[PDB]
Amino acid sequence: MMVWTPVNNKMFETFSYLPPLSDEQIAAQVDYIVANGWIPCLEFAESDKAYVSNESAIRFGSVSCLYYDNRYWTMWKLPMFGCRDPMQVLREIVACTKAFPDAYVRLVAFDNQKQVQIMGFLVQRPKSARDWQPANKRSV
Amino acid sequence: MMVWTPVNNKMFETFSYLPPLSDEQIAAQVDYIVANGWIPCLEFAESDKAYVSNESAIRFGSVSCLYYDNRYWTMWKLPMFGCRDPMQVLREIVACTKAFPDAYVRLVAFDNQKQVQIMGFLVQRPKSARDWQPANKRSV
Amino acid sequence: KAGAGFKAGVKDYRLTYYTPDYVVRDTDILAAFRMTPQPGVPPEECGAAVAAESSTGTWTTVWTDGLTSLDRYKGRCYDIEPVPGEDNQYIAYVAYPIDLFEEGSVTNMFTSIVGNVFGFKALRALRLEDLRIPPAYVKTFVGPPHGIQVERDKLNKYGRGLLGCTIKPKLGLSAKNYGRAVYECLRGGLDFTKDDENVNSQPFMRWRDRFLFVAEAIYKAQAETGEVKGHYLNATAGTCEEMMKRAVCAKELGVPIIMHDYLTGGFTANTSLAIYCRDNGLLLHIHRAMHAVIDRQRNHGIHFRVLAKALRMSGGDHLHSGTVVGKLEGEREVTLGFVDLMRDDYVEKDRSRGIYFTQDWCSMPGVMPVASGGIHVWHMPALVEIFGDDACLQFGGGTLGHPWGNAPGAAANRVALEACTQARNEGRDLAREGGDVIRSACKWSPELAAACEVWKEIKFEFDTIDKL
Amino acid sequence: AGAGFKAGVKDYRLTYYTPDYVVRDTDILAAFRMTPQPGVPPEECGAAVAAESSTGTWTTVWTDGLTSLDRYKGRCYDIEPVPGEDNQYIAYVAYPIDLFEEGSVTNMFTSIVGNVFGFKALRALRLEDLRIPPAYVKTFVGPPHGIQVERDKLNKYGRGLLGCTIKPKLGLSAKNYGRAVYECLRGGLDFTKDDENVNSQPFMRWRDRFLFVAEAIYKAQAETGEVKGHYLNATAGTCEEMMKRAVCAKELGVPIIMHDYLTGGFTANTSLAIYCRDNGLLLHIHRAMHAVIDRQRNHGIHFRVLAKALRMSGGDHLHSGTVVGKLEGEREVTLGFVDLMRDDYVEKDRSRGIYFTQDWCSMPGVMPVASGGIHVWHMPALVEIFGDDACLQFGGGTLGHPWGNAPGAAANRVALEACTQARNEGRDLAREGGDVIRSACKWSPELAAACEVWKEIKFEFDTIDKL
Numbered sequence A, B: 001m002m003v004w005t006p007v008n009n010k011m012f013e014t015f016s017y018l019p020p021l022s023d024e025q026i027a028a029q030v031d032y033i034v035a036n037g038w039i040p041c042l043e044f045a046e047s048d049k050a051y052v053s054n055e056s057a058i059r060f061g062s063v064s065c066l067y068y069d070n071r072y073w074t075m076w077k078l079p080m081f082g083c084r085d086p087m088q089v090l091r092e093i094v095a096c097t098k099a100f101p102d103a104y105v106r107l108v109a110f111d112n113q114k115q116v117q118i119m120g121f122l123v124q125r126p127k128s129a130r131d132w133q134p135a136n137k138r139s140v
Numbered sequence C: 001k002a003g004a005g006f007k008a009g010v011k012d013y014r015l016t017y018y019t020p021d022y023v024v025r026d027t028d029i030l031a032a033f034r035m036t037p038q039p040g041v042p043p044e045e046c047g048a049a050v051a052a053e054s055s056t057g058t059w060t061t062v063w064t065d066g067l068t069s070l071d072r073y074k075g076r077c078y079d080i081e082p083v084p085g086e087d088n089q090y091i092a093y094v095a096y097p098i099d100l101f102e103e104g105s106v107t108n109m110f111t112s113i114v115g116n117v118f119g120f121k122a123l124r125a126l127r128l129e130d131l132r133i134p135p136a137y138v139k140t141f142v143g144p145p146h147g148i149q150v151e152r153d154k155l156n157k158y159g160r161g162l163l164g165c166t167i168k169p170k171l172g173l174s175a176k177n178y179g180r181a182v183y184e185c186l187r188g189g190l191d192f193t194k195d196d197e198n199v200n201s202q203p204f205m206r207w208r209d210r211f212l213f214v215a216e217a218i219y220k221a222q223a224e225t226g227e228v229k230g231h232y233l234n235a236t237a238g239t240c241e242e243m244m245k246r247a248v249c250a251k252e253l254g255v256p257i258i259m260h261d262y263l264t265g266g267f268t269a270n271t272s273l274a275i276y277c278r279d280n281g282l283l284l285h286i287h288r289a290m291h292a293v294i295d296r297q298r299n300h301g302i303h304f305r306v307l308a309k310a311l312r313m314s315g316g317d318h319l320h321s322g323t324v325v326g327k328l329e330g331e332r333e334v335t336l337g338f339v340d341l342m343r344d345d346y347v348e349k350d351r352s353r354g355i356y357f358t359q360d361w362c363s364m365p366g367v368m369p370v371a372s373g374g375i376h377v378w379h380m381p382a383l384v385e386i387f388g389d390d391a392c393l394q395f396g397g398g399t400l401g402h403p404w405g406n407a408p409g410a411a412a413n414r415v416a417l418e419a420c421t422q423a424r425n426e427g428r429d430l431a432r433e434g435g436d437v438i439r440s441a442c443k444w445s446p447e448l449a450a451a452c453e454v455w456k457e458i459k460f461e462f463d464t465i466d467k468l
Numbered sequence D: 001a002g003a004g005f006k007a008g009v010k011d012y013r014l015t016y017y018t019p020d021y022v023v024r025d026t027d028i029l030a031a032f033r034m035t036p037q038p039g040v041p042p043e044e045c046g047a048a049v050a051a052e053s054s055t056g057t058w059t060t061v062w063t064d065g066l067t068s069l070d071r072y073k074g075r076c077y078d079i080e081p082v083p084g085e086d087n088q089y090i091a092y093v094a095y096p097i098d099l100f101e102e103g104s105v106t107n108m109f110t111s112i113v114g115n116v117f118g119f120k121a122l123r124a125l126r127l128e129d130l131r132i133p134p135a136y137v138k139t140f141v142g143p144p145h146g147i148q149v150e151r152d153k154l155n156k157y158g159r160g161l162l163g164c165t166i167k168p169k170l171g172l173s174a175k176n177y178g179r180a181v182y183e184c185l186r187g188g189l190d191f192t193k194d195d196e197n198v199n200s201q202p203f204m205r206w207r208d209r210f211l212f213v214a215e216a217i218y219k220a221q222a223e224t225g226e227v228k229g230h231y232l233n234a235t236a237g238t239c240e241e242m243m244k245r246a247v248c249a250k251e252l253g254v255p256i257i258m259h260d261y262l263t264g265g266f267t268a269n270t271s272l273a274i275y276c277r278d279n280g281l282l283l284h285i286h287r288a289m290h291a292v293i294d295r296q297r298n299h300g301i302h303f304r305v306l307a308k309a310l311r312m313s314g315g316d317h318l319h320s321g322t323v324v325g326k327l328e329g330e331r332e333v334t335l336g337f338v339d340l341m342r343d344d345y346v347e348k349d350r351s352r353g354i355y356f357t358q359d360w361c362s363m364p365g366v367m368p369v370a371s372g373g374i375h376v377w378h379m380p381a382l383v384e385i386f387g388d389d390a391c392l393q394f395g396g397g398t399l400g401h402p403w404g405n406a407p408g409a410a411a412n413r414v415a416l417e418a419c420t421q422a423r424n425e426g427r428d429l430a431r432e433g434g435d436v437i438r439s440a441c442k443w444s445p446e447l448a449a450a451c452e453v454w455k456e457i458k459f460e461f462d463t464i465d466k467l
């Protein structure tokens, strides 16, 4: 039996348990978003604002239930309303990551009917990050 | 259509809706007591304490639920423990009614297994009472 | 070396949960399940699955069993008996250690015993027929607010069954008309009247308005007759907060009794209400609305006797028991059986009455059975013969359906009851002389005579679904 | 003179059978699968059901004259024959909105299923569906949060959520419970949960459990960087005990609690749902005891009705069955009530057991929870059946993994994401499910180990609850 390492094994929600997504797999997800008429959008954050925290709760009474800091990230430009071209999305991913090379960047998509994010996955992790493991080192 | 009269039509629980019990019917109820091995007992009360009332509730907070004055009557001597002779019971009815000719008197019987009164009915009402109706005048 | 260790994978439930050589402990909760296995599934495996999934096991082997003692906590199917006349029906007996249950929580007991097992694909039908509630578990419950003896002592009523009556129409009456009907019913000779089970608080009649008018009716009828009167005001509500506001209002009005639909309101809310009633002196009448959704069919569900035991534990001074002869189903033998389970302190096993286990209530108060539904004056002899004095007989339509009105209708039922009670006390056989007792009473009771005329030919006789 | 009072019995049909009645948009409608006793006409039986579940009794009462029965009476307005049955009918009853107490599921059930199922005149009765009109739906607070809000609070999007029931059901100490929870959550599961029957017992008192579970939740969350939760059971014997447990969860800052709505009861459940709304707690609803009521086709109440009732009383999650697991759940019927609990508007569709078009008038959707005897090989079918808006739970499927809880969680999380990825890429899970899982096994030792253990395990039996 292999042991799942509890050290430097941070995840990033949807698809983080699969091997790193290839450009092709990412493009496929983008085609999925556009084909379904959803609204693509990019969000980013510096390292200290990447994972949920409880900092603000110091100002709270007994109302911390389901409150966490760092869930909100910074929006890159605006949601791509009316986008029907996967290429425009790939272009923005390049622009965003180029502008913030040391920040975490994630691609999301919105459904305005249910009014909720219907997809999301990390597309960039800073190079200096040492809190995660490659697919083959998640268990020892 | 006959109308049930609300005026001077006081009742007295078990058997008060039947025609007045004859001495023969009363004796039969006594045999019933002895045959079942229950404990006969007589109780009496003056007219003013014959029916339930709320007088004591004046001393209460919001706790009058199921509290009523005059449920308890006065015990004639003691319950006839070990009585297996109905004549004995009938003699005490005569003695009690003789001692308190103007009082309400009821015959009851106790069951010591379930520890509760298991029967009872009125055997005397003062001749001065004008708050009740004969069988044929309960409805007009 | 190497003792028993963790082995991942699926194995038959019976290997761990079918223990035919287990000797039941006196503190164990026992269950009798009428089980119908799917074709190809061994009865032993079916029973074991039931015992496992209602106690400690799941579909595959988990390593955590090793941290504790499965022998100590596991539920056990210790006996399986084929059902006579049934080719694919069995009575599976399961024993549950007392440690598996939260003290005083009927909700928890049901959650384990009937929580998920009724939906297993491996079985086609399943019915909980009985439960042996050991004294050790019975004692963890507050139980009924008062009980039969205490109720009679508070009402100062003895020597005859009590008489009730559901106001009608079920819904649609205003608060004042409700009180009007209530007053006319009570003043005629009925001890109680009551809100229909579905009368809570609605546009046509808000609850507090009803409570106030009913209080006036109760006190007027009591002053007029000289006998203690009551009307079960419904506390059943959508939330516990609303339920309590209603019980509090009844307390503040000084009235004697309220009611609650324990199954539709729920055990958690009912237990809380019963405790409140115990602490504030309110009698609590329990209506079994929805019970037939669960206890009607012989092949699947929960027999009413179990639902009755559950209520006795949760708390209730009254509990509808059926009438046998009325508009709703209630087979005689089955009924006499759970009536004993409801009122008595000790009831010995008796399969001829559906009593699968000897039940020791260890002094928990008895619950007053309430016979109600489609009964009238002619049924009186049978009702008294069936239930005896410790029961409340209710005539809704049987009172508000009288040609002369509520008061005369009430008097007719009170007369019929006392006539039958007197006849029994005199040694007469109500099963054979009932009709003559009623006819004799008609000679001096025009109220009863009118009632007898209207309903003389009305009977309810149909094939029984809930057969032993 | 005019209509007067005539004492005596008369057929229910004379007042309660109205085949020409035009239902109003505010009427609550019920569809009853009715089996009359021989000699009892279907219309009379349907009339009796309508009468005794609304305003009438067995004999004529003079009080009807004080009010208006035309305005309040329930009406059997239609009797439909049942194909393949010559003594079973679907009786439709219309109930005026005035008959119900606002926001009270308890009251709605008390009328519609209170006494009619026990009538001698009928042999069997089953409530198949209920049309809850928008005007009545609006009287309910409803679920504390709902699918969209829940996802927004957890910050989880793009895949089904993953849960797991701790095992053994009973018998574990409070600390061991927290131990198993931490190991489960740290491996990839979003949630873990108290078994439905885990409340407070000698082997583990609730407050001890809540505390250790909190440590486990926070440790797993810090380790993974993903929001974690464990449904702490608030189900209790009394409302006072129920609230004490909800309050403790609030004080610990944990995200979610659970309640067994049927064994605890609608009155208690509604109170708890309201508490959760005012305090920001997610509420997972377990349907313990539902099969006692909804298993048989001829008698009882179909789960779809029990689901609508829960959505009204309030619940963020509600178990929906798995279809392919150890517990029964026919596919078409399940797809039907999943839409009824999640969507805003559901068109009538008898092929899925939907007897009435249901308009929820913006009441929040309830997250369906597929749980019970499922493992990694079932993932393709589960994702295909439920889609992303559901929580798939693996209890034995996690704590039964040969390498432990963390690896077991990893296997399920991997299987879920692999299938989710596949679907989005355009692959057909129904046909390529096996290949998707086998491909993931190549780079996931945890998944491979899980696949080898349960490869031959399937649950396929004759369905009892058929349309």
Ligand SMILES: O=C(O)[C@@](O)(COP(=O)(O)O)[C@H](O)[C@H](O)COP(=O)(O)O
Pocket (backbone or CB within 6 Å): C166, C168, C196, C197, C288, C289, C320, C321, C322, C323, C328, C370, C371, C372, C373, C374, C375, C394, C395, C396, C397, C398, D052, D057, D058, D115, D118
């Ligand atoms: O709604 C009704 O039908 C009743 O008010 C009786 O009315 P009637 O007196 O007019 O018949 C009672 O609730 C039933 O007796 C309940 O059934 P059970 O006692 O079987 O639980």
Ligand SMILES: O=C(O)[C@@](O)(COP(=O)(O)O)[C@H](O)[C@H](O)COP(=O)(O)O
Pocket (backbone or CB within 6 Å): C053, C058, C059, C116, C119, D165, D167, D195, D196, D287, D288, D319, D320, D321, D322, D327, D369, D370, D371, D372, D373, D374, D393, D394, D395, D396, D397
């Ligand atoms: O007790 C159990 O069996 C479970 O914890 C599942 O365990 P596993 O994960 O080990 O199977 C769930 O409560 C059932 O899923 C309930 O049934 P449903 O979802 O049909 O209401």
Ligand SMILES: [Mg+2]
Pocket (backbone or CB within 6 Å): C166, C196, C197, C198
């Ligand atoms: Mg009723």
Ligand SMILES: [Mg+2]
Pocket (backbone or CB within 6 Å): D165, D195, D196, D197
């Ligand atoms: Mg469970």
